[PDB]
Amino acid sequence: SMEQVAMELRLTELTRLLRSVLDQLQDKDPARIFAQPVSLKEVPDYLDHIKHPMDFATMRKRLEAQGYKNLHEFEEDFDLIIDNCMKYNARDTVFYRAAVRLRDQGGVVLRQARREVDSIG
């Protein structure tokens, strides 16, 4: 139908805007701490601690399959990256600290993304 096509165009355009959001957030992680899944070869107990692992590569795979229907879904996954790290790692670690800085800096980007998503519809 024409309506299904219109809906698909909307999804494609959200995907475009989320790709730009993802790039901007990933620039706030210049150490690449959050770039890839925590390795289960290197951290074999990880899934005993963290039940829903997340990382920027995994988000990118979902994004390119147009698997984010709305900004909330996307933000859920970004918050998992941060929140998983802040639980597994202690306060005094470069990992925890990187997550804090990513959260703080990403907030600004996400605040305007929400306005753009609402504004453009």
Q: What are φ and ψ of residue 115, in 5° steps?
A: -65, -40
Q: What are φ and ψ of residue 93, in 5° steps?
A: -105, 155
Name 76's Cβ contacts closer than 8 Å, sequence gap at least 6.
Answer: none
Name 49's Cβ contacts closer than 8 Å, sequence gap at least 6.
Answer: 87, 88
State the sign of the Cα–Cα–Cα–Cα dihedral 53, 34, 112, 23: negative
Q: In 3D, which of 112, 46, 105 has the Cα closest to residue 78?
A: 105
| Dihedral angle over CA of 88, 94, 97, 101, nearest 10 | -120
Q: Tokens 């605040």 appear where?
A: 111
Residue ranges making up the domain that contains 67: 1-121
Number of other CB atoms surrounding residue 37 within 10 Å: 14
Cα 118 to the chain's mean position, in Å?
A: 19
Which phi-psi region, left, alpha or beta, contains residue 32 (left: φ > 0; alpha: ψ -120 to 50)?
left
Q: Return the CATH number at 91.
A: 1.20.920.10
| Tally: H helices and E strands in the chain | 5, 0
- State the total domains in the chain: 1
Name 77's Cβ contacts closer than 8 Å, sequence gap at least 6.
Answer: 54, 58, 59, 62, 68
Name 11's Cβ contacts closer than 8 Å, sequence gap at least 6.
Answer: 66, 69
Pair 103, 82: CB distance under 8 Å? yes
